[PDB]
Amino acid sequence: DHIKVIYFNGRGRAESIRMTLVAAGVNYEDERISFQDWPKIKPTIPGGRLPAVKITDNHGHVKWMVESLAIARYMAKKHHMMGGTEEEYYNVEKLIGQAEDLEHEYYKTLMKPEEEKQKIIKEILNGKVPVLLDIICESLKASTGKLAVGDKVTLADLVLIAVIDHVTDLDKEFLTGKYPEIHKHRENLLASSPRLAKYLSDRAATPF
């Protein structure tokens, strides 16, 4: 199958999908649409938003997929990255929920002029961000393995590292000297997944 992931030139909502396929060892075309080209591409995209995933089989079937974490969950499930048990499934989802909460704190700072971007950054870093990071640390501590849930890679591992990257975007040193579970998680995840480690080495700094 040809898998084409369509997004803007950034991590954003597409990163969960990219990382899932990378971790699973699945090849895909990573298509990045410039903001200038978006107006003409927009009508060709079912639903008119990105991420969109276009899957073509070798018998001409074209499957369109939207909603990033729905796609990632689908792909993760196909490749046994959503839990081995109902209990592991819950814990995978618990961490995705906690990480998405954090992602939505980070979203408040976006599309805002420098001025109030900084006021909002200070607000969330003094409030909900540390609250959510501790909660994430508690989830990680409760794992029976090296990773988020057990010893094998799940979607929770991937969702977590992408949102931490957004947190460090707001403040490079926010986790420095703190949240030992989150640091230890990223190192165990990179150790367990040479594919992901190489992927992360090869991208390709983006502002979002």
Annotated binding residues for glutathione, as ranges? 7, 13, 38, 42, 50, 67-68, 101
- The DSSP element (H or E) to which 94 belongs, if any, is helix 86-107
Q: Rounded CA gap, 153 and 95, in Å?
A: 13
Q: Which is nearer to ligand GTX, 131 or 191 (CB)?
A: 131
Window contacting a copy of itself (CB under 8 A); options: 1-9, 67-75, 113-121, 144-152: 67-75
Q: Which of a copy of itself, ligand GTX, none sits in contact with 22, Cβ below 5 to 8 A by type?
A: none
Contact 83, 94 (CB under 8 A): no
Question: Which DSSP state fits 198?
Answer: H
Please tell me whether residue 47 binds a copy of itself under the rule CB under 8 A: yes
Burial class from Cβ neighbours inside 10 Å (0-12, 13-18, 19+) for residue 16 reads: buried
Q: Rounded CA gap, 103 and 34, in Å?
A: 23
Please tell me whether residue 180 binds ligand GTX under the rule CB under 6 A: no
Please tell me whether residue 49 binds ligand GTX under the rule CB under 6 A: yes
Side chain identity at residue 71, one-letter code: I
- CA 2, chain centre distance (Å): 22
Contacts of 126 (CB under 8 A, 6+ apart): none
Judged by CB under 6 A, which of 3, 6, 68, 137 binds ligand GTX? Answer: 68
Contact 62, 54 (CB under 8 A): yes
Q: Per-residue string for binding with ligand GTX, 73-112, x by CB under 6 A?
A: ------------------------x---x--------x--
Q: Which of ligand GTX, a copy of itself, none sits in contact with 93, Cβ below 5 to 8 A by type?
A: a copy of itself
Residue appearing with tokens 């926010």 = 174
Please tell me whether residue 46 binds ligand GTX under the rule CB under 6 A: no
Window contacting a copy of itself (CB under 8 A); options: 3-11, 14-22, 71-79, 169-177: 71-79
Q: What number of H helices and E strands is found in the chain?
A: 9, 4
Binding interface with a copy of itself (CB under 8 A)? 47, 49, 65-71, 73-74, 77-78, 86, 89-91, 93-94, 96-98, 104, 135, 138
Binding site for ligand GTX (CB under 6 A): 12-13, 42, 48-51, 67-68, 97, 101, 110, 208
